[PDB]
Amino acid sequence: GSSGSSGPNASQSLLVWCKEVTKNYRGVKITNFTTSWRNGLSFCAILHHFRPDLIDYKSLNPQDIKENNKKAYDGFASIGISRLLEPSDMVLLAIPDKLTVMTYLYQIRAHFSSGPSSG
Structure with a gap:
């Protein structure tokens, strides 16, 4: 399917974007968008890719x-x-909201890689 920069959105695209920036990482297996992030590994891994001097x-x-x-x-x-997702929440419960998480993720991926223009 062709799309002239008209709101670029997809499932694989994301799972890949994260797995890409974290291709040369340790313990980074974006298997799911609920648990894989539940802890907050991929979240730190990504930010570490661009600026490894921002996180620990x-x-x-x-x-x-x-x-x-x-x-x-x-x-x-x-x-x-x-910020859309909360750190505590993840702990307050077991499995996060796939819908929510994904939403927040898209944002980050968008920032670095222009695309979606909300508002």
Whole structure:
């Protein structure tokens, strides 16, 4: 299907965008958009790709669900990426909202790679 830069959106496109910037990472397996991020690994991995001096992904781990998340929102929202997901929530529950998470993700991917123009 052809699309003249008319709101670029897709499932694979994303799962790939993240797996790409994290291609040369350790412990980064974007298998799902609920758990894979539940902790906040991919979130820190991505931000680390562009600016590895923004987070501590260098010495991070899946043992941190709230932090890993907070750290991200702190950096991403630092450039101007409105925060949609919360770090605590992830802990308050077991599995996050695929719909929500994905939504927030698209934003980040959009920032670095222009595309969607909401508003």
